[PDB]
Amino acid sequence: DVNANQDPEAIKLQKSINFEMSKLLDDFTFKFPGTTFVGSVNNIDNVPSSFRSHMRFEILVPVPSEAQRLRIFQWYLSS
Amino acid sequence: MKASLTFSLSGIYAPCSISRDIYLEYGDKKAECLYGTIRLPQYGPGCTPGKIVHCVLDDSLPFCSIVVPSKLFGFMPTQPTMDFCYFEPILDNVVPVLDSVTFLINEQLYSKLMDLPQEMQQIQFLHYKYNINSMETVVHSRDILTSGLCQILNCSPFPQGLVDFTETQLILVNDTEQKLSALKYANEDEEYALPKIGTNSALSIDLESLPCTISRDLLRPAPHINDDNSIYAFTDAETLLRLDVTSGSFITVSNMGCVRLVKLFVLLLPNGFKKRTIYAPPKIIASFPDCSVVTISKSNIGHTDIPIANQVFISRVGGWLQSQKCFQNIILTTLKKFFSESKRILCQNDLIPIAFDSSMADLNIAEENDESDDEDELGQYYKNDSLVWFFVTSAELDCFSKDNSHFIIDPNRTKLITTNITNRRPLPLSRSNLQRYYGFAETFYYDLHIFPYVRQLVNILETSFNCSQRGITLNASVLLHSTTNNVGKATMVRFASKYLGIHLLEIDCLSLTSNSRQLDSTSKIIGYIRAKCENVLPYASPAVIFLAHLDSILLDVNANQDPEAIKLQKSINFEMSKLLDDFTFKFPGTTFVGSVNNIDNVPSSFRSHMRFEILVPVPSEAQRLRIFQWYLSSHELNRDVQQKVPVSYMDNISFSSLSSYSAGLTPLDIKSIVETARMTATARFYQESKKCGWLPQSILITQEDLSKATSKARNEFSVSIGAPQIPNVTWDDIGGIDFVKGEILDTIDMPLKHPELFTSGMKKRSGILFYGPPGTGKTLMAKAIATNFSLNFFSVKGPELLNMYIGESEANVRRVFQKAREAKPCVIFFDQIDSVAPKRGNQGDSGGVMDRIVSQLLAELDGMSTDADGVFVIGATNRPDLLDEALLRPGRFDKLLYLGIPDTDTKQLNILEALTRKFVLDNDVKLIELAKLCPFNYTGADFYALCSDAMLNAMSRIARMVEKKVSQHNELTGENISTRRWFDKIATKEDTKVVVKMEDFLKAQEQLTPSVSRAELNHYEAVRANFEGA
């Protein structure tokens, strides 16, 4: 995220990196056939708006419920 | 089209005769009467509008020639004329008609015609005397009908149009002063004496600068190819044949200094310049500073002998433009252009001006023409921008005596070389105007008598210059500091440079490339400044070194910054002082002229050491008028525009009214308004031109466009200072009011105009307080005053001023008033002022916040009692007794207005009429009965409520109308349109016209109780019983 309260000449690198990364996004998507770009993020809000919009259909991954736990215990305790 | 021209004596508006050909290919055989457009070349960069003239055939005239009456331009054909003119066919032979033409007429014939008992006699006398025929004679504006008898004052609405008594008033106006007798349309009839002297001796005449560049076409003798271009000179007087040498000969004496060869021509008919003077180009005039009048005589040399000098070592004058690194290239290229194209006469010890364009410098063209097909890449793309001089510096060695005078630099037999840089003074403004001649960005021509600060500065510069001649020296140093941006300090300095010829070294601390914080960059900033100065200064003649926006560098000491930054800033702070000292010491005349935008920021180490501080104010009434007169002048609007049609303005606009409107505007604002007006005019013209045809002569500024532009610029500035967007309201939107209008005029209007009376200020009327009953047009009155009087508007919206802390509300009050004071012509509107300034010592303490509020307000409002006028405070309340007594005394809230319910039938009807503006009463119902319906108990807001109820009823009616109408096309049985956008189907928008009827007003009167209780009116009458001052 743009912490615009930070000192100038740092936020300028922030803009640079954000935009240039998105540039590579588009470049890969359009220059090559079959690029998909899966991303993973530790907390969604921190992805800047300038970049958040581009992607589509983000997935929330909730923690497993007891029905999932039943299968993962059987996985670790497997033969 | 181009054709030959000839002049003849004839009536004021006799039809012009044209040759057989012009008539054939331009005269439409179906036209009952032929018309055309005629244009005259002039000594100037622009072109005047063309005269639309009746035309007749004349086979006697030769191929493509036209004869026109001299009186069409006030000329006499008994003196040298032009050989050609321009013609344009009439667009479909369509000619407009005028409405309110005006003729001035002398007292004698005016009175004589006045005693006559019949009116058509004057109409017939028009034809009898001036050969005018109705519906056929085209008249022109400002034309003198006959010298000493009568003159045309205006044409309207078009400057040119047909005369039709059924349409034109032809207003004869008495010339009581009888100045038309002195206003001869022609210059004169004869010279002082025909014989004069058989062999006239050398004569002393005034050598003055030609105010424009000449066109090579309009020279009576035909000049020989590729020679003598740079030594043209012009004159009109009898002197050309006083000396036996004919036109196109040479003259040399030129004050009997080092004689400068120059060629003299004849000035032609329309030229309005002064007689018995020699008009010279910059080159000739640059050699003669001062010595206004110079001796001149004939020089029958026979030919320009000795056209070959082996070499010539030219040199470079010292100046700011010359010494720049980047420009070093283009100059030499333009010099190589200067050579090998024509035979140029170079009298040694003389200047050579060379024009170029700065913006092209960093770019370049190839050597293509040098390689082959040597030609100039047409200068039509190279608009000359900057000027630099060069000096001959060479009396070349050759096998002849006095060969340094009147030689030529042959393209192939001679080569020029550069020696070094030299030093001289340029010309002062009053001596000549290089920018005008070359059409550069003309720096404003102040009039010292009306701009104190430019005079105060020029006095310092002139005294410094004169001291420079003395043996003694003193360190002149000036610092221009101003309250707000865009007040022309750099224009000030540049004008000061011109008016005295002081060289200008222009360095802007913005442009210098070192980083703002100048981290480890002292040697960068100061190396750059030091180099750019010392490269030019030692060879510079007495020079002003101008530091634009010096504040950028000279930052103040920072109390909240890292020590290293503070130390490196102190370093430059000290070294700038040291640099000023050393430069002041090194050479005489060096004048340090810095500029800042806020004096308080300059450090003490520099604030004290500096000598002179000049406060440059926002221009006053007397000044903005001049600024307007400048930016609407012909030579400044045509400059930016290569389009064929010239621009100009209807003379009926009153500069004074504009100046009144333009209060509080900076000069840049004025240029903005002017250019926006030019927008509106041009757009109007181009939009309208698609019609059949009219108004082709020129695209004209008009007063309404200028006023609209003012309205725009006002609000845009007001947005810049954060004001609210006051809606458009005018006096027409208020009614029931007679005396309070007079009061508000006496308070605001009277001091605005006629400033000569309130010379000392006298602490003019200060406070308008609208008390009395509620809901009666107070906020309306305020927004009206705001919109109408051309004042910025600031508003304090009730108890908004309070806050959640100690003191910060007093910060609020001081900040609002500060913001008011920094836009001096302003109004501060207090609405519900009882909330902010309640009575002190009552209703408990509650921490005393309200007391500290009213104390701060009381102390700021007009406590300081000095120059606080120019900002007016207007307040309104439900009840005054809430207001503290200390605000009631005159000088704070002096004029109390009992604006309230009308209580009288006529005033009620007046309110109806006023609110009927833009309303759609279009019926036999009359406001008389409508007033009779509603008793006086109804309020001022009441009739607005009634009007709105009527409007809403009309909307309901039309709504059901539209619904049942579209129910005939939207239903399935019709199946026509179901877009729910039926106004496309109902394209007859007039069908939608809502109009009120007695149904509406009757029901409203039925369904609209008075919005003030008998109890409420009684209570506010009681409040009135607290009748202030008793």
Next chain:
Amino acid sequence: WCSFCYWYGPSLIVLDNVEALFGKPQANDGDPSNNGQWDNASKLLNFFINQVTKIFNKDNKRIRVLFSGKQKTQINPLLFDKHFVSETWSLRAPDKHARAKLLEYFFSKNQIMKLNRDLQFSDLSLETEGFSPLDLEIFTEKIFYDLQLERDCDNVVTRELFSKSLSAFTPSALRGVKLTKETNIKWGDIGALANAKDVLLETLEWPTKYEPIFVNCPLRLRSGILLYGYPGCGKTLLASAVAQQCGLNFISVKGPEILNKFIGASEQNIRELFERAQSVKPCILFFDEFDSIAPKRGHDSTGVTDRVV
């Protein structure tokens, strides 16, 4: 840039996202005294203005400039000080017809999708009213994926498909706010006051629906309505419904919330509402419990209530 455009005759320089280079690094309520924020970039802007004004004074057709930034105000105020620019063309959020007009194009842009049977996007625009021309492309791709993953239909969209895809997606604007409100849409409740509810419906909607005629209105439109009622006989629910008609946005205050004991906030909280309302769009600005704000025509005590009113 100035050299090239000067040589190439009548020409434009157009700068996208200009704030990235000429934008002011805003002061963050820092010190104004150090010449404000006369940073490197305001300096560059001033340089550019000078250098272009130089050419522009020579011939006005030879150059023009075309800036573009998120919002007008936040571009460097030096532009509006030196009077370098005066134009107010703003790309408003497309509404109603616009939505449909370009939805089709997206549907046929690169993929070739077929609309559901017997429709012409008529109500496809009615929903997703706040979507931007960025949101619409994403929505189209969303629909594409949703129908494609079904494996039984790959040619035509369906109403239930659109209903499913409409959830789990939000407009870019207000995407990150994560705010859920006004789920209480109950327009269907006729209520008992339908006899005169039409008057309210009129005064809120008709001035907008019959747009062309009201352009000719020379008098300020009736705009305020007040409603008594025996305690709580449906009042907030009615307000909610009249909000959910959606011709206007809605925000509301409940009277006892704002009557702080603190002198300043007590009045400042009213301005807090207007400052936001005026900043967005036409709004209802509903006062619930308005009795508690009203001052009972008090003039003697001059309590804070008087200040608020």
Next chain:
Amino acid sequence: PTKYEPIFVNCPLRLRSGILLYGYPGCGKTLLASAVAQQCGLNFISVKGPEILNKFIGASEQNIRELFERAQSVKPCILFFDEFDSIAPKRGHDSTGVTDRVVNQLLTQMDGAEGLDGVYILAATSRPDLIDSALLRPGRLDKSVICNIPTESERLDILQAIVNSKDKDTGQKKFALEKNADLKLIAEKTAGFSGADLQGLCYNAYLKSVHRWLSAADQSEVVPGNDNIEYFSINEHGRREENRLRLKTLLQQDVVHETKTSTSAASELTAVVTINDLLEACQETKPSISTSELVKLRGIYDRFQK
């Protein structure tokens, strides 16, 4: 202490200093203070009411201290509090907010151990006894000076002053006096409103009078005669008044400069107010009326009992 300085620099006892001005509003207090500057030639630091107070706790302290330190940096200086009630009210028997800070600061800076010198604190307000008694202690603000609005039969002296005021030396007058100058009649007629009332009368009468020279009853300066109708009998169209006004504006294309005239009795371009007509302004201007203030002034000067 500066005009006759060799004599007044004789004693060691600290020069009697500080003045508190009090009495009716609009009676020349802020004037009388702000006029001292050029009359004496001292510096005049200005404190435009409660500028010192600040939202932060103790910022007012750093403000007052810096104020006095500034005053001590450049010396001597008059130090004028344009009002002295809202700053430093009478200390209550409790916290009473931040005011008890500022008060106890001002006392410290006034007569602290490291006592300043060469600074003259000049205070004014309408209601002074709400200043803390420890600020009225002689040695600080020690001389209390009443000003009075009634001055029956002395209002002539003020009137004559204000009318004869010549502040702008460019002209030998600003107000347009008349020859008789029987100011006694109006002075008596004033009924003793205030001190600013008379300036208000002056300006009001000048307003009512200026219409004579400018408006001229739309007959004495505009449309004065021969030049009323120089156009001919208009019959082509009904435009009669606006037409002639437009023609008059158009014909006034002449240019002049320094068009001075002194048709007035002893003034340039003005219509001197006839004091008889000036009598018409007495019934409009208003006083500020309060007996509470009269009673209240019983107290500040030793309650007229002690």
